[PDB]
Ligand binder design. Structure first.
Ligand SMILES: *[C@@H]1O[C@H](CO)[C@@H](O)[C@H](O)[C@H]1NC(C)=O
Ligand SMILES: *[C@@H]1O[C@H](CO)[C@@H](O)[C@H](O)[C@H]1NC(C)=O
Ligand SMILES: *[C@@H]1O[C@H](CO)[C@@H](O)[C@H](O)[C@H]1NC(C)=O
Ligand SMILES: *[C@@H]1O[C@H](CO)[C@@H](O)[C@H](O)[C@H]1NC(C)=O
Ligand SMILES: *[C@@H]1O[C@H](CO)[C@@H](O)[C@H](O)[C@H]1NC(C)=O
Ligand SMILES: *[C@@H]1O[C@H](CO)[C@@H](O)[C@H](O)[C@H]1NC(C)=O
Ligand SMILES: *[C@@H]1O[C@H](CO)[C@@H](O)[C@H](O)[C@H]1NC(C)=O
Ligand SMILES: *[C@@H]1O[C@H](CO)[C@@H](O)[C@H](O)[C@H]1NC(C)=O
Lengths: 509, 509
């Protein structure tokens, strides 16, 4: 309680609780009357570690970057217990019977969540009569009990075409996504089981939603699935499947495995209810392997930014395109640009590096680059360029993380290694991660790629080729240090890389 | 040609060419008459890098650890071209018409391989009349041409039940494994396409074989598949599927994705033909991201050890078992044990570390541990133990790689980071890799696990829980340095880990 790392460590525009522990985001919805985005979260107010009693924390936002934290929304009946993950729906037509005439239809808020008690996980419901700040648990909870220890994380949505509420929920250790239906929110029927992809140890946090295909009238149903432990990257990861849904079973178009975000730190993704126009969601931005040991205090964990989800046909090799999940960050105009560097058609060479030259630093930056690979035979050790994110100098040292692209491998990479920062379970804190991408485009016969990145004091979110792939990782600079400036460098004497466009901004609340 | 790193860098019992570049192993077969294992391989004699003309190199062995290199077996028609990957079968009954009355049935050797020419990849055959040392290409090559640029890596086998030769080959960029049948080895018919798992950039090096289930009469068909680039670990990786095969189509038992080896350096896996009793195979032990840049000379690349493949029902979580691919290394008794450390029931503590104390070092070691996790509440930074593989001291420093287990994560890990060793494309040389495993067993209520590891100068092969998962990685110690001794250490004051059995051996040719 006496050490506060916020000054250098606490994100400006990623949500964090003032104190205590946060994991999975819950009950994501938009209130159309109040015009407020609601974020709830797995919350332990009593320590910077997971533990019971576990609650739903609650915060609101009008723009998905500025958050007001509120009083705890739901709590367990005993210290022995926890209100585990869930989702919220708006029961406009009072199908649940909970709501007065005088409750605004857009605020008829129902939470559906896992109630965790010793040897039992059930699905329970509660309703809010005050706009989502307090709740009354349903008299006849549980609404679903299958006598299981491992039965959690409901995502519920109204399905017009089959005229019912749909729940996807994990039967975690059976590796099944279970699909239930209800008229009621109270009485549920099991319609199907879905099993596929990368099983790890466990299925968690399913989601199922209609995602729009870019430049078209058409859509596909996407099933989201979280697994932890046992990610091939180590620990926790989120995956997806593309297909069709009739209200009863989900049928994927193929049987391939794909991850939502191939950084180490993007887990328990959930989408917002009541979004008109598109699909928005966010995740918990850490990894279960080390999330409770990173050096922040008096809180641990942030969410990712909210992101916009679409589908796009992209080349995965030279011959073949696949319909692929695209995501791009939600950043409203209510963000102040303190300063920016903006350049066009720069021929990058080791004698001409790009260097930010701002007066100060908030620790929040973004960078936005479109680049072209030239025809130049260069030595193997130099077929790359690198973006450096440097702290201020402190113990007469600068800390930095590196983001680059190698043209011989057609792959982006990050290196988040920081010397002299140690914490428990760092054996699992992978430093070097890569992503292979086909060109965004061809200009004549030269390969074009794009990269957008945003750095917020302890988290970096990278989006390659207009969101073709996303990679999210936290990073921990030494005590007192935070991002101060940005450089783009290369070791080539002539130009291998031409940056058609470079924009680097310092940003603030 | 003047620098030779062999002294510290060249494996003793993993095959390497004397000079030049090697990638994928080819034409693996056992000659029953000669009693010789044959290894062919993608070979460039003219540089320590991939390039055309590309040949099949050739080596033989009576025990799968001692290799005799021979003259190039197959070469391209022009410098423009390459004999890409392939397999060998023994046509005992002369179905191909190539073989005399006086050619021993067990030596009726036919190679089936991809002929790579500009804008064209076809499948071609050649036969050997002198036991596999020289070949005559078939008069009417190609045997299969589908007018494709991306059509390569045939694995062929006799399928008794449908009375035909089967070929699995990759239609690389279409992400299809294509299954062809022949009476002939000359005239082929397409029977099915198979598409699943982790797509990556490209399908390569398929395999299809009947694998025995442990302690039973039963078996399953396993389909192997290599992808590169685009492994979720970065670069190249091998995956598999378990199911059934009728000679015409492969039908997996589920749609899950699983990798054969979750280290960075295990690619283009092939099995040996003419193995009676079980399934044996090996891979190329590097990763395409950096294989051509690692600091060895005058050669680059080794194969993995030959491994024995079985299927076993293992716990993937506390509730659920899955039928899972098991592998264990083939190490004959023709291996000399120079010295060994052997201990039983050791309560590991930071005051009582295990330390090898041998007179010298060949650079080749193995370690074999069964251990039990005790009930001891210890601080989070200490819930692990570590195996250290140390070089001799040189520039007044010891280089080392680390292999460990953390009990809070139930996961093994490696850290192959070595200071002051640099080479091109090391951004992709991932240092930290993990593997989550359920307990091998329970002793009362205490968790039991096992680990076998083998280190051979520049390559480490780890096998967790009697081969439940395998992890293969190269490593590059500083100039002159190689493994000299081994330690097992922990930071706990009391004992969290009891090692029921520990055997560390120094080994030699
Ligand atoms: C946990 O937090 C709750 C609410 O802030 C508080 O009532 C309680 O005392 C804390 N600790 C325990 C063990 O309940
Ligand atoms: C789905 O899974 C559960 C196992 O938990 C089983 O009880 C149920 O019968 C299955 N339903 C269908 C439709 O397969
Ligand atoms: C979501 O992205 C989509 C593009 O399909 C757009 O319709 C919508 O306005 C976006 N919402 C936000 C908050 O950016
Ligand atoms: C990065 O580059 C340009 C700058 O206007 C733009 O097309 C693109 O939207 C930028 N990306 C983001 C996410 O702001
Ligand atoms: C079989 O062919 C070989 C190889 O050229 C030849 O030497 C041999 O004499 C032939 N044997 C018979 C029986 O024709
Ligand atoms: C096998 O896939 C090939 C290559 O695309 C295709 O032409 C052929 O029609 C496929 N056959 C079947 C039965 O799917
Ligand atoms: C391969 O391992 C299997 C496992 O039972 C065994 O039957 C066979 O004899 C082994 N062969 C070798 C060379 O280890
Ligand atoms: C290591 O020890 C096990 C169990 O004691 C033994 O059965 C096995 O043969 C050894 N394994 C290897 C790969 O040498």
């Amino acid at each position: 309680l006496s050490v506060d790392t916020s000054e250098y460590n606490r994100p400006l525009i990623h949500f964090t609780p003032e104190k205590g522990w946060m994991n999975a985001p819950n009950g994501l919805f938009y209130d159309k009357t109040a015009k407020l985005w609601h974020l709830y979260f797995q919350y332990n107010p009593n320590a910077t570690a997971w533990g019971q009693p576990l609650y739903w924390g609650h915060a609101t936002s009008n723009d998905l970057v500025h958050w007001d934290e509120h009083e705890i929304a739901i709590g367990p009946e005993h210290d022995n217990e926890g209100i585990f993950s869930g989702s919220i729906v708006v029961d406009h037509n009072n199908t649940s019977g909970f709501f007065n005439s005088s409750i605004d239809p857009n605020q008829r808020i129902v939470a559906i969540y896992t109630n965790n008690i010793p040897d039992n996980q059930t699905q329970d419901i509660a309703f809010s009569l005050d706009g989502g700040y307090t709740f009354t648990k349903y008299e006849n909870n549980p609404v679903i009990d299958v006598s299981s220890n491992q039965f959690r994380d409901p995502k519920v949505f109204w399905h017009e075409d089959s005229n019912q509420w749909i729940m996807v929920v994990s039967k975690s250790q059976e590796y099944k996504i279970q699909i239930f239906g209800s008229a009621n929110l109270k009485n549920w029927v099991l319609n199907s089981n879905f099993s596929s992809g990368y099983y790890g140890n466990q299925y968690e946090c399913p989601g199922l939603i209609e995602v729009p295909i870019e430049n078209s009238d058409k859509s596909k149903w996407v099933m989201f699935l979280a697994i932890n432990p046992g990610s091939p990257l180590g620990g926790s990861i989120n995956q997806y499947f593309v297909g069709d849904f009739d209200g009863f079973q989900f049928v994927p178009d193929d049987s391939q495995t794909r991850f939502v975000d191939i950084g180490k730190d993007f887990y328990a993704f959930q989408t917002f209810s009541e979004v008109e126009h598109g699909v928005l969601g966010l995740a918990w931005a850490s990894n279960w392997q080390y999330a409770d040991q990173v050096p922040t205090n008096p809180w641990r964990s942030s969410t990712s930014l909210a992101r916009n989800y679409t589908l796009r046909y992209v080349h995965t090799n030279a011959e073949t395109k696949q319909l692929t999940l695209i995501q791009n960050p939600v950043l409203p105009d209510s963000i102040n640009v303190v300063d920016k560097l903006k350049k066009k058609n720069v021929k990058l060479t080791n004698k001409k590096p790009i260097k930010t030259n701002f007066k100060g630093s908030t620790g929040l930056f973004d960078f936005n680059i479109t680049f072209k690979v030239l025809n130049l035979n260069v030595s193997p050790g130099k077929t790359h360029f690198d973006i450096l994110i440097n702290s201020q100098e402190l113990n007469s040292s600068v800390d930095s993380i590196k983001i680059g692209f190698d043209s011989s491998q057609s792959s982006f990479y990050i290196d988040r290694h920081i010397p002299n920062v140690e914490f428990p379970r760092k054996q699992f804190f992978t430093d070097k991660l890569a992503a292979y991408l086909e060109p965004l485009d061809y200009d004549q016969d030269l390969r074009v790629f794009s990269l957008y990145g945003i750095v917020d004091k302890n988290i970096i979110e990278l989006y390659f080729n207009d969101g073709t792939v996303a990679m999210t990782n936290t990073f921990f600079m030494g005590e007192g240090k935070y991002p101060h400036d940005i450089q783009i460098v290369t070791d080539t004497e002539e130009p291998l890389f031409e940056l058609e466009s470079v924009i680097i901004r310092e940003l603030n609340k």
